[PDB]
Amino acid sequence: EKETIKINNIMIHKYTVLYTSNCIMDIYSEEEKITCFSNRLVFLERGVNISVRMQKQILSEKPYVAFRLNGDMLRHLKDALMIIYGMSKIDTNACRSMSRKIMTTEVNKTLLDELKNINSHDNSAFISSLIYLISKLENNEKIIESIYISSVSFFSDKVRNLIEKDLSRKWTLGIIADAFNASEITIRKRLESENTNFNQILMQLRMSKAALLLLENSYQISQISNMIGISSASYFIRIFNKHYGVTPKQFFTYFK
Amino acid sequence: YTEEKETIKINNIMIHKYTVLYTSNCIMDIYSEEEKITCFSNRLVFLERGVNISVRMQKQILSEKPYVAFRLNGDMLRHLKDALMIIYGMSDTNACRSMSRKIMTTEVNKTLLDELKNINSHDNSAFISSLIYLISKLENNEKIIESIYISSVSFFSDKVRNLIEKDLSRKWTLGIIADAFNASEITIRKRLESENTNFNQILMQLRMSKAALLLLENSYQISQISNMIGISSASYFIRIFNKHYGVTPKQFFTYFK
Numbered sequence: 001e002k003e004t005i006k007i008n009n010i011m012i013h014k015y016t017v018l019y020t021s022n023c024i025m026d027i028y029s030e031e032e033k034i035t036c037f038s039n040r041l042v043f044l045e046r047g048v049n050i051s052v053r054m055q056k057q058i059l060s061e062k063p064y065v066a067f068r069l070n071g072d073m074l075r076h077l078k079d080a081l082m083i084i085y086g087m088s089k090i091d092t093n094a095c096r097s098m099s100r101k102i103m104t105t106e107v108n109k110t111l112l113d114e115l116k117n118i119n120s121h122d123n124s125a126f127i128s129s130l131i132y133l134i135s136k137l138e139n140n141e142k143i144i145e146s147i148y149i150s151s152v153s154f155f156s157d158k159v160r161n162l163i164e165k166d167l168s169r170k171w172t173l174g175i176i177a178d179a180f181n182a183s184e185i186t187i188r189k190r191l192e193s194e195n196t197n198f199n200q201i202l203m204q205l206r207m208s209k210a211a212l213l214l215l216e217n218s219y220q221i222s223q224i225s226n227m228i229g230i231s232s233a234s235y236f237i238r239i240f241n242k243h244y245g246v247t248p249k250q251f252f253t254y255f256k
Numbered sequence: 257y258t259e260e261k262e263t264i265k266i267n268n269i270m271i272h273k274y275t276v277l278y279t280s281n282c283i284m285d286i287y288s289e290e291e292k293i294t295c296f297s298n299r300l301v302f303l304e305r306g307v308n309i310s311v312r313m314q315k316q317i318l319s320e321k322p323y324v325a326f327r328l329n330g331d332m333l334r335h336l337k338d339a340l341m342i343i344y345g346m347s348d349t350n351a352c353r354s355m356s357r358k359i360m361t362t363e364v365n366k367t368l369l370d371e372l373k374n375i376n377s378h379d380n381s382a383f384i385s386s387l388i389y390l391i392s393k394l395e396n397n398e399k400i401i402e403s404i405y406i407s408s409v410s411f412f413s414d415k416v417r418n419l420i421e422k423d424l425s426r427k428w429t430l431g432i433i434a435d436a437f438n439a440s441e442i443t444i445r446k447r448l449e450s451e452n453t454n455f456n457q458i459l460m461q462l463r464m465s466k467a468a469l470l471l472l473e474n475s476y477q478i479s480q481i482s483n484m485i486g487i488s489s490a491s492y493f494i495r496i497f498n499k500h501y502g503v504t505p506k507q508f509f510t511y512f513k
């Protein structure tokens with residue numbers, strides 16, 4: 001009688017738009033809380049780390065519908081949104097708040113129709129539809145801010161881009177210190193000003209790739225483990241359970 | 257049955273702003289030069305900035321107005337051009353023209369008709385978003401995007417217009433425009449000849465457009481209008497308006513109200 005699940009330590013690596021087709025989910029980012037009811041839209045700003053508690057309505061269907069944007073697209077939308085609207089200058093990368101990174105609204109019939117006939121194959125049509133949707137929302141300022149913030153490239157993003165070219169290699173701080181011509185102290189203090197370290201980034205990348213590949217339903221567990229750079233399958237199951245809080249079979253069964 | 261003539265022919269109309277028109281209740285034939293484009297009952301029409309046309313019009317209901325119109329100023333047109341270039345990608349020769357590439361009718365859907373309905377021209381940005389949404393929904397819309405870019409650049413005739421509009425009732429000559437622009441008279445008329453116009457035509461079109469617009473405000477006498485556009489007498493003004501457009505100011509006002 002488990003139509004509920006708790007998941008820990010999820011990263012949003014792409015600006016994400018979510019629609020609750022059938023679930024109710026509470027979100028604990030750090031030490032706050034935002035709950036999302038049945039029929040709503042959610043805007044998730046790129047680079048937040050959050051934990052979730054979900055309850056489904058119907059078991060024979062999946063909990064939600066998701067739209068994600070890559071970097072080219074995100075930049076385009078930022079550009080055209082700059083042209084159509086104004087330009088703000090809270091450009092100081094200082095104070096954050098969870099309530100400026102997560103947002104929910106109540107979906108209408110007219111928004112729902114356009115949401116229906118969205119097919120993420122025609123790129124320009126997709127950009128048009130998102131701008132149309134944003135225009136119909138009240139207090140949309142908070143969204144445009146979050147779309148600009150997530151368009152700038154930090155040093156951690158360069159480290160990530162470097163790592164993604166060979167995920168099954170065995171990286172160390174010394175090797176990263178070679179590609180960027182600097183010292184280990186320089187690189188570790190640079191990543192320390194953004195409140196992270198090298199092991200954290202490597203772990204988040206590998207567990208993101210694994211969670212995504214599990215849902216394709218076209219590779220054994222050993223194939224996934226060899227793809228992300230891990231010796232044995234049983235070791236991989238231990239680490240997945242310790243990071244996310246559930247087993248790969250439970251994850252797959254819930255989200256199908 | 258003479259008072260029941262609710263059909264009309266108008267001559268020498270000049271489009272000074274990119275225009276989107278919706279045939280709420282009439283039927284319309286458009287003779288630009290020596291071609292013809294007809295527009296049926298329930299359709300959308302796209303008119304490219306700077307074309308000169310003549311029109312024949314027949315109403316469906318007599319006690320109501322003929323159509324609904326949207327016009328865009330320069331700032332707004334430029335913004336739409338910019339964001340449009342962003343979304344669809346950058347891609348002029350300025351060679352072959354065609355009246356079939358400057359005036360285009362389409363068939364509007366019911367949901368598009370709704371989006372057009374809930375248009376209130378108070379939120380400026382919202383209008384740009386709705387218009388981009390509409391354009392994306394159109395099949396074979398490439399021919400449209402071209403006409404919005406073509407009419408977004410500033411030509412030499414636009415410099416002449418901007419100079420003259422700062423004092424409409426003054427008495428200009430080709431000599432004065434030849435001094436302000438550091439050049440010769442032959443230079444100026446050969447430059448304007450390459451855009452297919454001359455200076456007297458531009459002056460006359462400007463004065464007749466401002467007048468036709470003021471007539472519909474319904475709050476200025478004829479002598480007031482004539483003084484405002486730079487013309488001596490009211491009777492002279494009526495003569496010129498009738499010769500240019502093909503109808504009398506009473507006929508124009510009575511029809512379009």
Ligand SMILES: CCCCCCCCCC(=O)O
Pocket residue numbers: 010011012013014208211212255
């Ligand atoms: C099952 C929830 C979907 C996301 C799971 C974690 C994947 C990282 C998201 C991303 O790459 O932007």
Ligand SMILES: CCCCCCCCCC(=O)O
Pocket residue numbers: 269270271272273327465468469512
């Ligand atoms: C019913 C309109 C009669 C024609 C008047 C000419 C005005 C065109 C200038 C403009 O586009 O603003």
